């Protein structure tokens, strides 16, 4: 990897070091921290708002399903740490997300959304990306949607599992 | 003019020789404006991994016709390679006569332009792209070569936009 | 506005038409709107920031005075239109900014905090500023103050009163 | 600082060395002279301006308040050291500035007002700029009142005195002073 | 030779390394494997054409007639090595090319079709080329035939014979 | 075709104008002249050389077969027109060649042999190039040999007859 | 003449537009205003200085003599028009300039000196140049001296009246006479 | 001094080395030769040129008045050294110059006039310039006369005797 | 011909218009007036030269010799017309060449000297050049000796004497 | 001569190396070969050209007169090596120049004709050149004639000796003496 590249499947993923909200406190999160696992990132338009984050509630509520089986879930938004933290902090009648079981990252300089070729430059928001990274820092799987349609946590899950297994074995189940 | 197919933007036009029911016919992305399109790439003509996903992929046609969507496969393999790979039976690893167009990107323009081309290897990737009737790409999937994509994801995601784009209104939630 | 520059005193203010939360609704707001009036532009901390009860309340209390004396204030920040809303809805007794009587002008794509050169792209945060802009669009009083300081409402209305006086009639006052 | 950056807050202020009128005699002034002790650099538009001289007198009275806090006041304009020295040497009552307790600067070569962004290129004069410079030579505040309005010395004083708080505490105080 | 060049007569042949089919097994045949020997480099464009490729069977059946003079036969095309392998396993009756004793190089990225300059960049295929490369790696020969017919078998022997006799004895 | 390009199969033939020996006398020959017959444009290395005559006599003697099939035969070289004409005068026993029935184009400034890129520049000579041009100005065949072995008489004639059929039929 | 060029004899003189001190009031002086007369353009380094430079006085009295001979004197400096104005309103005995009958131009933005090549960039003053510019706008004569020494006014008038004469006759004079 | 700038006031005199006619012989004159003296460089229009006999003779005649304050005088032109030679031999009485006691700097490839900027590009002669240089190599005064006004022995010298003294004093000089 | 070239045989020697010494006075000559005749331009090292007046008087002496064959003799040097004029008015005792019968041009500003490529930028002088311009404006001949040898006038227009007869004229 | 200068008087003679027809066989000729002698280089357009080859015969039959003085004659043309061969194998009655006493250089890639700029570039031929070259490899004389007129040998010799004689004493000769 060099600085100046956009993420491209099969190639080294751009590294980060960023402030993050973990279980209600501030923590510094990097890609090197998780090297040795797979790391899943998913993007969303807007904090503290509608659009019905079906997929985010799915992943975060499904966080456990990722953890044991060998995957690491990460969220991201172009907000600052204070908005994300406040939006896990506050209750649901205040428009909160409630506490979640996965690490959340604040990219407030846009570096990540720029890195993976998601950011909408005019709107300062992100399309719906889903990217999967391996323990060597390579991006195995990417899905991207427009902002009217959601995710599938189970598709990503089994695909993760499969790529994991096939890496060590080098085979792939037939058909 | 690197077009670089990207989500929520116009689809790059391409015109490529393709097989429609065992006969040579020119297929462009122009034909179906007004209809959805799912453009899916396969690694190799006569690949070595497994036949019987492929037999299941080639079988699904009516499912995108009911909800008003077109299926297309493309590869950097030649038009002829794809044809002959429909003409070989499945027992030998082939296909047989099938109902889906098989696009030939040998010239590398299409696959390059959508960013699924591996420039060193001159082979396609696991790509899948959804293009709406007005030309905007609403979805893309990419997997690493070794594991296949899923027809069910495409089928679901096309109808999500069927209903939501159809209404013209926000939805609860 | 050349499609260039940054920000400079005198020469006409960079125009913008974006969005804002005015009194809890999203009114489409442009600086074009306020031609014929003075406009005072003020930048604020990130959502859910860390500040005392008095300072913040002050400028909401004087919010009405700009409406009175013949001028319009624009709160703005590199924050998001939705997050800010969340930070007015949440009442003060619970730690939220509470209701404010001025527009909160939302720049999440960094346009506003970019034209005026207050954004340090590393932090994604805007430094304090006061820009006096006449009905003609000319930037006259520049203030970069800095993160920690109160936006002085008596200096802001001193500016409104005095500048408006000197261009409205033309005689200064000595000394 | 690299040779042609226009001054920007939080970054090393452009260093200068310039002819200056101090206490009726010529002296060279540069950033490096003042090291850690703060510096307040203020520009004045014109020597022998028709504007009220009072803006200046107050500054002298406030200089001592800047001194007790470990700060230093400075003045600058595109006028040459003869115009500025002539504008101090004439009594306050006769239309000049008379003697004052604060240094001046002769920018006759127009370097500073550029590098610091307070210059009007066509007029070859300075705006009302105010720069507050730190021990390590960092610009944490700038204010520009255009040309029709002078500055507020109690404002600037709270700003110096008040940034010493954030510096020496290492923290930001929403309500403190 | 700088990289980026096109094949030129009396000059070093552009180096290449590819995957190639040998008797139904993958092998990396590169170029250097054959140093010290004439190297017959032939391109056959995309397969599956009505016209009869009977001439290639003359080479394949005569390849022991060739090899005795110290030559290595190679064909190539822009298909994938799995594609080539499929057209190699398909018998000749049903439109394939079943038997071969000669390596078939798959260059789909075009490095081989592009580097010796037999290419149509828009068609992603070559013309019908042949390059005879001496033991030093120099291109001694260039033939290019159009798409309608093909090349000629005895010509290659006549020329390779000629360059053997002339390169050995010095007399022309 | 654009100027500066090199010829190739399927592409327009470069135009040129050159001094040439025709049945013993100078003439200005240009490619556009012969549009409407096939044209076999070949090159040969040097005047008063050794391998050349026995080869050249082959196509030269065939002039009636190529003019019967509606073709025109041309050789070219970087030697001077004078060297070709004198060559044509020198009789095969003592002579290099003997008089001949086919036009011969001498490019002494070297620009032509550049145009089709068969010229070996460092030596200022040309290989044995073989080009077949149709009435539309398209090259249907190319052969590039080295200097030690001649081409063939039968192959060009067989090829011209071969492409005629596909042109007119299918 | 084009923007950015340096003043050179035999070429069109760069025009000028500047705020100037004319008889106690501000007036903007331009070159097109004098077309039909010669213009003697001069420069002085700094207002409110010592050593009572008398070159200026010489160009004032001699300005009377020019207008008698039909020429126009102009100074200039990059001192601001307030410094110059204050220094004209200032009586001479105090170190001031006293009253003056010639226009005095303010170069405050340095645009003119860069075009006649008399500007000192790092010191921000103008050399002592002397340019005689005719109705056609051409420079026939150049005198540049170091700032420390005054010009000879008598030579200025000598040659000025000189080139008006030679311009009328269209031929050189072997021996100057007065 | 950098090659390509055309002299200036206060700036190093361009170095040059040019064959010169001195008292009927050829000698190499470089300005380095005169380091430690003042040097004066004047340009005469031509050789055998039509000019008043009295004006030309008087200027040449004074090398004593320059020597007495320790200064060297030099004339120059673009003609070849042989033409100027013939003009120093050819008696004044005949309409010529006559013998002359100061070197004659002739440059027929024009270098000198180019370095000092008096080269008239399309003529090939220089106007009447006279330059004063001190025992450093700095240019203290520059006069470019038009070709129709000769020099003034008193105006060329007066400034010289003045610079010797104003420099020598090393003290400020009262009004 | 181009603007900025030097000079080349057959590329039409750069024209000019330049002040010339003619029979003792100044007269304006260009390479125009002589269209229709040949012109021989020749350069000499110096004016007032200390070297060899004899060859010089012998050079000037031939004028009618070029008029009879329809040719015009001009010389050129970097000495000014005021520097070069004085050199025809001086007797031998002072080193004078004498009054001469052929025009002598002063190229002081170097335009020509540089144009024809004989100039030495360092020395600021021209080597002895010779050019023959034909009525049609084409350079038919050029000779350039180094400075140590003059011109054989026989070598000067001998070539002209040949060109008259090559033209055939009838 | 920096490799990409064109032949110019007093500058290093361009180095060149060529196959040549000398006395009925080939050979390699270089400028490097002769260092220590002068060299007189002449061009002629083409082989079996129907302008009279009297210019070539002149120097050739005179080759020894350009020798005893310690000089060497060189001919060059754009012809091939077998073109000059065929052109030396015709006796003069047939239009050829027969055997020759001087080296005949064959430049068929033009490097010599391009180096000295005597190429006619569109036609790939040569004008009639004559150049004088010193032992130190520097061109002190150049003559170009059109194709229509030859090059007098005697004049050329006259130009050959004097340069030698004056190089030896470093003294110029005012008035020439055979």
CSV table of C-alpha atoms in Angstrom, one decimal, chain C residues 89-160:
chain,number,residue,atom,x,y,z
C,89,UNK,CA,-34.7,18.9,21.3
C,90,UNK,CA,-32.8,17.5,24.3
C,91,UNK,CA,-33.6,20.0,27.0
C,92,UNK,CA,-30.9,21.8,29.0
C,93,UNK,CA,-31.7,20.1,32.3
C,94,UNK,CA,-30.7,16.9,30.6
C,95,UNK,CA,-27.6,18.4,29.1
C,96,UNK,CA,-28.9,19.5,25.7
C,97,UNK,CA,-28.5,23.0,24.2
C,98,UNK,CA,-32.3,23.4,24.4
C,99,UNK,CA,-34.3,25.6,22.0
C,100,UNK,CA,-32.5,28.4,20.3
C,101,UNK,CA,-34.2,31.3,18.5
C,102,UNK,CA,-31.8,31.5,15.6
C,103,UNK,CA,-31.3,29.3,12.6
C,104,UNK,CA,-28.8,26.5,12.9
C,105,UNK,CA,-27.1,26.3,9.5
C,106,UNK,CA,-26.0,22.8,8.7
C,107,UNK,CA,-22.7,22.1,6.8
C,108,UNK,CA,-21.9,18.4,6.9
C,109,UNK,CA,-20.0,18.5,3.5
C,110,UNK,CA,-17.7,21.2,4.9
C,111,UNK,CA,-18.7,23.8,2.3
C,112,UNK,CA,-19.4,26.6,4.8
C,113,UNK,CA,-16.5,25.9,7.2
C,114,UNK,CA,-14.3,25.7,4.0
C,115,UNK,CA,-15.1,28.9,2.2
C,116,UNK,CA,-14.3,30.8,5.4
C,117,UNK,CA,-11.1,29.0,6.2
C,118,UNK,CA,-12.0,28.2,9.8
C,119,UNK,CA,-11.9,24.4,9.3
C,120,UNK,CA,-8.8,22.5,10.2
C,121,UNK,CA,-9.5,19.4,8.1
C,122,UNK,CA,-7.6,17.2,10.5
C,123,UNK,CA,-10.1,17.8,13.3
C,124,UNK,CA,-13.2,18.3,11.1
C,125,UNK,CA,-14.1,21.2,13.5
C,126,UNK,CA,-14.7,24.9,12.8
C,127,UNK,CA,-13.0,27.6,15.0
C,128,UNK,CA,-15.1,30.3,16.4
C,129,UNK,CA,-16.0,33.1,14.0
C,130,UNK,CA,-18.0,36.3,13.6
C,131,UNK,CA,-18.5,37.6,10.0
C,132,UNK,CA,-20.3,40.9,9.6
C,133,UNK,CA,-21.8,41.0,6.1
C,134,UNK,CA,-23.7,44.0,4.7
C,135,UNK,CA,-26.8,43.9,2.5
C,136,UNK,CA,-24.3,44.1,-0.5
C,137,UNK,CA,-22.4,40.9,0.4
C,138,UNK,CA,-19.1,42.4,1.5
C,139,UNK,CA,-17.2,40.8,4.5
C,140,UNK,CA,-16.1,43.5,6.8
C,141,UNK,CA,-15.5,42.3,10.4
C,142,UNK,CA,-13.5,39.1,10.5
C,143,UNK,CA,-13.2,37.1,13.7
C,144,UNK,CA,-11.4,33.8,13.9
C,145,UNK,CA,-11.5,34.0,17.7
C,146,UNK,CA,-10.4,30.5,18.7
C,147,UNK,CA,-12.1,27.4,20.3
C,148,UNK,CA,-12.2,28.5,24.0
C,149,UNK,CA,-13.8,32.0,24.4
C,150,UNK,CA,-17.3,33.3,24.6
C,151,UNK,CA,-18.8,34.9,21.5
C,152,UNK,CA,-19.3,38.4,22.8
C,153,UNK,CA,-22.8,39.5,22.2
C,154,UNK,CA,-22.0,43.1,23.1
C,155,UNK,CA,-19.2,43.1,20.6
C,156,UNK,CA,-21.4,41.5,18.0
C,157,UNK,CA,-24.2,44.0,18.5
C,158,UNK,CA,-21.6,46.8,18.8
C,159,UNK,CA,-20.6,45.7,15.3
C,160,UNK,CA,-24.1,45.5,14.0
